[PDB]
Design an enzyme around this catalytic site. Structure first.
Site, PDB file in Angstrom:
ATOM      1  N   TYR A   1       2.817   9.794  -0.232  1.00  0.00           N
ATOM      2  CA  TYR A   1       3.912   9.442   0.623  1.00  0.00           C
ATOM      3  C   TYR A   1       5.522   9.461  -0.002  1.00  0.00           C
ATOM      4  O   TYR A   1       6.341   9.346   0.807  1.00  0.00           O
ATOM      5  CB  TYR A   1       3.877   7.802   0.633  1.00  0.00           C
ATOM      6  CG  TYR A   1       2.165   7.282   1.292  1.00  0.00           C
ATOM      7  CD1 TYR A   1       1.397   8.405   1.767  1.00  0.00           C
ATOM      8  CD2 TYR A   1       2.063   6.056   1.309  1.00  0.00           C
ATOM      9  CE1 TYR A   1       0.419   7.863   2.150  1.00  0.00           C
ATOM     10  CE2 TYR A   1       0.793   5.616   1.527  1.00  0.00           C
ATOM     11  CZ  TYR A   1      -0.138   6.558   2.066  1.00  0.00           C
ATOM     12  OH  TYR A   1      -1.240   5.975   2.558  1.00  0.00           O
TER      13      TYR A   1
ATOM     14  N   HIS B   1      -7.878   9.162  -2.556  1.00  0.00           N
ATOM     15  CA  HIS B   1      -7.024   9.319  -1.445  1.00  0.00           C
ATOM     16  C   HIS B   1      -8.096  10.098  -0.175  1.00  0.00           C
ATOM     17  O   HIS B   1      -8.068   9.356   1.093  1.00  0.00           O
ATOM     18  CB  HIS B   1      -5.685   9.979  -1.442  1.00  0.00           C
ATOM     19  CG  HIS B   1      -4.921   9.593  -0.130  1.00  0.00           C
ATOM     20  ND1 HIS B   1      -3.506   9.458  -0.318  1.00  0.00           N
ATOM     21  CD2 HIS B   1      -5.008   9.070   0.944  1.00  0.00           C
ATOM     22  CE1 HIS B   1      -2.983   9.001   0.694  1.00  0.00           C
ATOM     23  NE2 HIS B   1      -3.935   9.002   1.715  1.00  0.00           N
TER      24      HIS B   1
ATOM     25  N   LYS C   1      -2.679   5.859  -4.992  1.00  0.00           N
ATOM     26  CA  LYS C   1      -3.544   6.727  -4.580  1.00  0.00           C
ATOM     27  C   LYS C   1      -3.460   8.160  -5.094  1.00  0.00           C
ATOM     28  O   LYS C   1      -2.463   8.544  -5.201  1.00  0.00           O
ATOM     29  CB  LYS C   1      -3.853   6.853  -2.949  1.00  0.00           C
ATOM     30  CG  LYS C   1      -3.871   5.636  -1.989  1.00  0.00           C
ATOM     31  CD  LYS C   1      -4.199   5.826  -0.695  1.00  0.00           C
ATOM     32  CE  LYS C   1      -3.919   4.565   0.221  1.00  0.00           C
ATOM     33  NZ  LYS C   1      -2.570   4.557   0.382  1.00  0.00           N
TER      34      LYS C   1
ATOM     35  N   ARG D   1       8.694  -9.152  10.061  1.00  0.00           N
ATOM     36  CA  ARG D   1       8.675 -10.679  10.030  1.00  0.00           C
ATOM     37  C   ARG D   1       7.734 -11.154  10.983  1.00  0.00           C
ATOM     38  O   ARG D   1       7.015 -12.108  11.024  1.00  0.00           O
ATOM     39  CB  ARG D   1       9.926 -11.261  10.665  1.00  0.00           C
ATOM     40  CG  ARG D   1      11.263 -10.854   9.448  1.00  0.00           C
ATOM     41  CD  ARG D   1      12.633 -11.457   9.920  1.00  0.00           C
ATOM     42  NE  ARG D   1      12.660 -12.966   9.814  1.00  0.00           N
ATOM     43  CZ  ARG D   1      12.942 -13.645   8.864  1.00  0.00           C
ATOM     44  NH1 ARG D   1      13.181 -12.877   7.532  1.00  0.00           N
ATOM     45  NH2 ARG D   1      12.930 -14.926   8.963  1.00  0.00           N
TER      46      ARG D   1
ATOM     47  N   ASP E   1       0.990  -1.318  -0.176  1.00  0.00           N
ATOM     48  CA  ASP E   1      -0.084   0.038  -0.008  1.00  0.00           C
ATOM     49  C   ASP E   1       0.967   1.262  -0.076  1.00  0.00           C
ATOM     50  O   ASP E   1       1.735   1.558   1.027  1.00  0.00           O
ATOM     51  CB  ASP E   1      -0.879   0.062   1.194  1.00  0.00           C
ATOM     52  CG  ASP E   1      -2.061   1.477   1.161  1.00  0.00           C
ATOM     53  OD1 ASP E   1      -2.949   0.928   0.564  1.00  0.00           O
ATOM     54  OD2 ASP E   1      -1.477   2.228   1.663  1.00  0.00           O
TER      55      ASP E   1
END
Ligand SMILES: NC(=O)c1ccc[n+]([C@@H]2O[C@H](COP(=O)([O-])OP(=O)(O)OC[C@H]3O[C@@H](n4cnc5c(N)ncnc54)[C@H](OP(=O)(O)O)[C@@H]3O)[C@@H](O)[C@H]2O)c1
Ligand SMILES: O=C(O)c1cc(Cl)cc(Cl)c1O
Ligand SMILES: [Zn+2]
EC number: 1.1.1.-
Length: 320
Positions: free
Chosen positions: A52, A114, A81, A275, A47
């Site tokens: 960003y 967005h 977005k 992880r 995503d």
């Protein structure tokens, strides 16, 4: 691990997703390493967004993992977005094309509006006048959606959806004359403090997937998130559940979403936690434990985005 949901357009979305946003102070290079780590760990849903300022890095990461034979392009579900400065119909496809250029990819799996409040077109993501006041724009979001639909027609986005939309705004799109494609999803804040029951039920009713962001209680970046808000992952009930199951509060919060029919994002730039997050598939919660997590709801919205309050399209004034 690889569990997916069928979207309303027949495409499949992995139900666990890697959030790639970091607070401004985090160097761009970190998005590259974290995204590679995430794919190595088993994440297949990634995503991101033009906002960003990391699409070059995330794209590099994804293509690196395809080059080295770890995954095929068809194995990766990549979301972008459309930012508020490109809501005008004629700016929609250029914005998507710019994200694609940055990523060096030929298509995104998912393209989202967005946030429903428009801002003045231009290079600045948050344009302000000479006194520091946000320069809002007036744009018909139905016209925006029609341009987004044409990106699906073009093959530039496999699926299309929305983010931070309330019920009224979903209805506006759904009820639009000559609708071609319903949004496949509504990506919204969702976690045990703010569990979005009413909106979840509404999205379910319209075959729309609810995708939870800030599912671990958010990055808590100032001035975006009130530093005085309670810290989700310090919650005593999540901690007790974690201990009982030999998991972590984060993993409890993630599993909660999966079992209630919510696709869930998780951001980490920490190898260990990356992880750890994929282990959400390794255990389950009972119905009684799910009810206990339902009782945690507090009406705590971490990301009010209230710098954008004022315009009619501000989504968080409505009950849901
Ligand atoms: N559509 C929108 O308007 C919107 C808004 C907000 C977010 N999003 C998307 O949703 C994503 C996730 O939301 P978010 O960025 O607010 O963060 P989040 O996923 O709620 O996580 C918040 C913090 O939790 C930490 N964390 C991760 N795994 C952990 C674990 N197992 N144990 C303890 N801490 C852990 C992370 O720090 P470390 O990195 O140090 O591990 C991260 O800073 C974003 O990156 C973005 O992709 C979209
Ligand atoms: O992650 C996002 O999409 C996001 C959007 C906005 Cl507008 C603001 C912040 Cl702080 C975010 O994290
Ligand atoms: Zn002046």
């Amino acid at each position: 691990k690889y569990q997916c949901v069928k979207l309303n357009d027949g495409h499949f979305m992995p139900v666990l997703g890697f959030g790639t946003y970091a607070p401004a102070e985090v160097p761009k290079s970190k998005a590259l390493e974290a995204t590679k780590l995430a794919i190595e760990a088993g994440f297949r849903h990634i995503d991101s967004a033009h906002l960003y300022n990391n699409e070059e890095q995330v794209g590099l990461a994804i293509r690196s993992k395809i080059a080295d034979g770890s995954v095929k392009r068809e194995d990766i579900f990549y979301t972008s977005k459309l930012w508020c400065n490109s809501h005008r119909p004629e700016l929609v496809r250029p914005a998507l094309e710019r994200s694609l250029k940055n990523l060096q990819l030929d298509y995104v799996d998912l393209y989202l509006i967005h946030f429903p409040v428009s801002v003045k077109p231009g290079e600045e993501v948050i344009p302000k006048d000479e006194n520091g006041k946000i320069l809002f724009d007036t744009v018909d979001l139905c016209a925006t959606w029609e341009a987004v639909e044409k990106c699906k027609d073009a093959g530039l986005a496999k699926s299309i959806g929305v983010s931070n939309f309330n019920r009224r705004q979903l209805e506006m799109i759904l009820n639009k004359p000559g609708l071609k494609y319903k949004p496949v999803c509504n990506q919204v804040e969702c976690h045990p403090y703010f569990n979005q029951r009413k909106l979840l039920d509404f999205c379910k009713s319209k075959d729309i997937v609810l995708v939870a962001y800030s599912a671990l209680g958010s990055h808590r970046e100032e001035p975006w998130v009130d530093p005085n808000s309670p810290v989700l992952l310090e919650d005593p009930v999540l901690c007790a559940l974690a201990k009982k199951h030999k998991r972590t509060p984060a993993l409890i919060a993630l599993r909660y979403q999966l079992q209630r029919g919510v696709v869930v994002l998780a951001k980490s730039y920490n190898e260990q936690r990356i992880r750890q997050n994929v282990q959400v598939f390794e255990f389950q919660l009972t119905s009684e434990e799910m009810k206990a997590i339902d009782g945690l709801n507090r009406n705590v919205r971490y990301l009010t985005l209230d710098i954008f309050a004022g315009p009619p399209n501000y989504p968080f004034s409505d009950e849901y």
